[PDB]
From a paper:
1-Deoxy-d-xylulose 5-phosphate synthase ([name]) catalyzes the first reaction of the MEP pathway and is an attractive target for the development of new antibiotics. [name] catalyzes the ThDP-dependent decarboxylation of pyruvate and subsequent carboligation with d-glyceraldehyde-3-phosphate (D-GAP), the second substrate, following a preferred-order, random-sequential reaction mechanism. Here, we have applied our previously reported truncation approach and removed a disordered internal loop, to successfully crystallize the [name] from an important anti-infective target, namely [name]. Following the truncation approach, we were able to obtain protein crystals and report herein the first pathogenic [name] structures: a holo structure with bound ThDP and a structure containing the enamine reaction intermediate.
Residue numbers in the entry:
A (entry chain AAA): 27 to 202, 223 to 285, 304 to 613
B (entry chain BBB): 28 to 62, 67 to 203, 223 to 278, 304 to 612
Write the structure that this text describes.
């Protein structure tokens, strides 16, 4: 890999022959295949942008010309051409190379958000900034996938960009899951379609756009996984589960009920809805990267008498907040939302962690939110959600393997008592374990037992609204501690406190969960250990509170 | 006098063109008499007659985007006699209402959603085997600048399910982009005040048996030349004052420069006002881009509409630590525009945002001061929220303690019984509560924390000196300011009892702001009686 090890930055491409560029592209593909197989990450989407990224850095002068990747999962070649080729041994590892652009890593990186369809909106802003600061001849380049182009923010941005001569180059990276509408005749100059694996053709198209001195669309066609047949074959975004359990449960319920329909915002595979679609192909809708449309179209389906199940990863549901509020909840419609990747996900960094949903959903009048503690409770809570015919329901659960089943000692006022004070200890601490933190709560209760502190561990199952069961048990204990895989601001703990205070119960409450912060990438287990969300650190904390009385 | 003898749409079916021209004139006189959004309704008289001459509501659902222009629809569906009660408590809604009519589908005033509902309903009819239901979405040129329309059109374009997209274009503030060649059948432009031409175009669309755009051109206020407050005025004046001194300040509105107070800003600094269309999401992320280019954007979006921009505040502004100031007018109860207008979500939503700072001005001087403070934050998002309407006289403070303004303190001889944390617009009510409690021998410290989030050290310091903390907020209590104060105290190991007095987490029907507050017991009499109960306990 003689060619690649000589690239210090973009200008090192500037005097290469097409033969050298072709050799470099082959070295980049070999590098990506071997590095990304070792670390995991977005191999297919990066293989598809080798020639496109070489062409961008042969035409544009980054960062004078900002290169803004929509989503940013496809910026590995960009990082390799901006001095970070030696950092791939640490890709997506704690203290290592981010899976997304990072302002901390490089002057060439602008946007760290993985939330799709935002690049063109940043581009409009930056182009306006350059005008307002009198920066000469800065060309903002937005690299937008066909998937990202199905998001509404792109239409808002293109309307704004089209109103001005400020130079924004809209590079559509089309490997399609893309738009059903034409973007050849919107009033913006259109160049293409260009073969995105013909580096010279991409350079000519971009150079032509750069010289246009006004907004222009450059439509490039690429192949996801180009050069690596397994990635080409599977068209995969990256290389006993919660998701599988959801998938199987949903198929079970849809077998007994023709009114169930499923909706994904472009992630039928990862949400477990491909298996559902194979059994009920008329009842699965993939709406593109369009969480807002997923939710309001769900409202329309419910107005026509159906019970939509909308499966959207926790973090991405932020996009649909106003649709949950004004389209679903305002109309008392039975839409069930299923939020996979709830709580810390870790390795995709700050913009992927599912740590907002309990706080956001708590704002929605009349909402019912469940957090499954295990496989059986996911099945049961899904059935209970499907039985709610008069308002929105939500289930949230983490990525990865479902923990073993924990059967309750008893159910009181909706709440599952998982553990009660044993062998002469008293009702000291009510530990309210939200969702997947049940096993950690049981380990905390055992450590506290050994300190002489008696713990009742409950799973409220339905976290919102706060149930009678929680109020009934609270008054029997000296301290209530909520333990949640969610931001503590407006989270389950603050809701439990608010519900007790509303009921004139002033038992001391503590909110143990994620501090209201953006977390850098690391494994889930490393993020939780660094925050002290471990049975050892939580038991130590609760001991201090009980000692203080 | 035919309008009073229209029972529903079928009463138009056998009218002559001369009778339709008479009825349109009667509808225009009735609208002026009774109205609410007059201009938009005068613009859709012939369009609405034509819709109800072609489509069979509600077999053919007629969904108004935003729904402010559905008065003629109500008059043609048996509700003309109800206009005596328009936007009055227990009276006719300013928006479509499923409770009022089988002909009404969507009650949300939030623009650009109609096509998404239309997609879902069309899908439902297919899945339930309902024959020959044509969903009609009536979308304004403004509404069509919203991202939801692009998501909906992309989905609608993928299917033969009949959705008729009726574009009500009075902008020729609509799209800069062409919708004449998206892959969808396009009919028009049609003269929207030629009832017969509009029916011909619509009938063509109904018979097409696939999705179709019918482009209709209307004049807002048509037939009526005339159509052809203090808090906001204070914001406008203050922003102009700061921008005079600072070249880095830019203002952004999502299609509301006049009502947000930004027209006067644009008149002085025309290169520094951006109107992005009805595009709250783009407003916030373009703000992020402007801040990345070294500017300090001020984004003026009414409280309720800021819901749309939640993920852009989170992942585009806050994640990058960018200095965007959000200014939320119409914060708290607005009343007569009903459930989807009340600015009662913002303190709960903004509280989720890492590193956010949120101010709630108590008066004109504090709006000026807190805006100046926001403009000085260079490393993260700031927000100011204030109500619709006139602002009263300044409320003077006795002292500032850890950022917090003491508005009242217990009389010499009374104990420090209650810390009454008065958020923004409820300072006058908190001072009235304090005077009533004084008369019962109950000592009250009233504070305006000014910066509600994060909860200040001044709140923590005063809390430990009182027996009871009561927060009073013009916001939903779930995740609201009271719950945030409680959470901050408990985090600081302070277990002083806290009570969260504010709006229950409910959608409110239309009524005046005063009526809504009185019905919830948000009055100085009712709050003082509640606090008396707690103090006794
Ligand atoms: C990484 C991640 O979170 C991805 S990558 C991806 C597909 C992107 O398709 P596009 O065509 O734009 O790119 P391509 O990979 O080059 O084909 C999705 C749906 N997601 C999840 C997702 C969902 N919804 C939103 C709003 N943002 C993101 N990032
Ligand atoms: C009433 C209201 O809240 C209206 S009507 C309107 C302009 C509508 O323009 P359009 O061209 O669609 O309609 P026209 O009146 O027929 O011209 C706006 C900005 N708003 C406020 C607004 C802002 N943002 C959003 C998401 N929804 C609304 N309703
Ligand atoms: Mg793609
Ligand atoms: Mg209009």
């Amino acid at each position: 890999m003689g060619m690649l090890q000589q690239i210090r930055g973009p200008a090192d491409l500037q005097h290469l022959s097409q033969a050298q560029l072709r050799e470099l592209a082959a070295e980049i593909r070999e590098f990506l295949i071997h590095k990304v197989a070792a670390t995991g990450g977005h191999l297919g989407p990066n293989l598809g942008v080798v020639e496109l990224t070489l062409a961008l850095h042969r035409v544009f002068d980054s960062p004078h010309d900002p290169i803004i990747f929509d989503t940013g999962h496809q910026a590995y070649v960009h990082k390799m051409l901006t001095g970070r080729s030696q950092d791939f041994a640490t890709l997506r590892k704690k203290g290592g190379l981010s899976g997304y652009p990072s302002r901390a890593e490089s002057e060439h990186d602008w946007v760290e958000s993985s939330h799709a369809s935002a690049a063109l909106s940043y581009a409009d802003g930056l182009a306006k900034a350059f005008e307002l600061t009198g920066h000469r001849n800065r060309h903002v380049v937005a690299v937008v996938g066909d998937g990202a182009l199905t998001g509404g923010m792109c239409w808002e941005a293109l309307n704004n960009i089209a109103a001005s001569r400020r130079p924004v180059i809209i590079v559509v990276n089309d490997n399609g899951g893309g738009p059903q509408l034409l973007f050849t005749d919107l009033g913006l100059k259109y160049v293409g379609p260009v073969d995105g694996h013909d580096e010279r053709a991409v350079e000519v198209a971009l150079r032509s756009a750069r010289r246009f001195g006004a907004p222009v669309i450059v439509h490039v066609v690429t192949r996801k996984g180009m050069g690596y047949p397994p990635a080409e074959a599977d068209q995969a975004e990256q290389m006993p589960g919660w998701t599988a359990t959801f998938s199987d449960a949903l198929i079970g319920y849809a077998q007994k009920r023709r009114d169930i329909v499923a909706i994904t915002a472009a992630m039928p595979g990862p949400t477990g809805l491909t298996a559902f679609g194979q059994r009920f192909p008329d009842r699965l809708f993939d709406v593109g990267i369009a969480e807002q449309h997923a939710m309001t179209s769900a409202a329309g389906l419910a107005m026509g008498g159906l019970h939509p199940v909308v499966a959207i990863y926790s973090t991405f549901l932020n996009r649909a907040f106003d649709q949950i509020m004004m389209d679903v909840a305002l109309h008392k419609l039975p839409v069930t939302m299923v939020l996979d990747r709830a709580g810390i996900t870790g390795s995709d960094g700050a913009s992927h962690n599912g740590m907002w949903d309990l706080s956001m959903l708590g704002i929605v009048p009349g909402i019912r939110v469940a957090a499954p503690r295990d496989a059986t409770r996911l099945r049961e809570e899904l059935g209970e959600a499907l039985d709610v015919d008069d308002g929105p329901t939500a289930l949230r659960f983490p990525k990865g393997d479902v923990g073993e089943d924990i059967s309750a000692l008893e159910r009181r006022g909706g709440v599952d008592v998982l553990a009660a004070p044993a062998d002469g200890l008293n009702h000291d601490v009510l530990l309210v374990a939200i969702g997947a933190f049940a096993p950690m709560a049981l380990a905390v209760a055992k450590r506290l037992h050994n300190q002489g502190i008696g713990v009742t561990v409950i799973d409220p199952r339905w976290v919102l609204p706060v149930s009678d069961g929680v109020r009934e048990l609270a008054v029997q204990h000296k301290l209530l501690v909520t333990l949640e895989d969610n931001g503590v601001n407006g989270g389950a703990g603050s809701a439990v406190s608010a519900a007790l205070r509303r009921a004139e119960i002033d038992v001391p409450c503590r909110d143990v969960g994620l501090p209201q912060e953006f977390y850098e990438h690391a494994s889930r287990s490393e993020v939780l250990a660094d925050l002290g969300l471990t049975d050892q650190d939580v038991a130590r904390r609760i001991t201090g509170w009980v000692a203080a009385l």
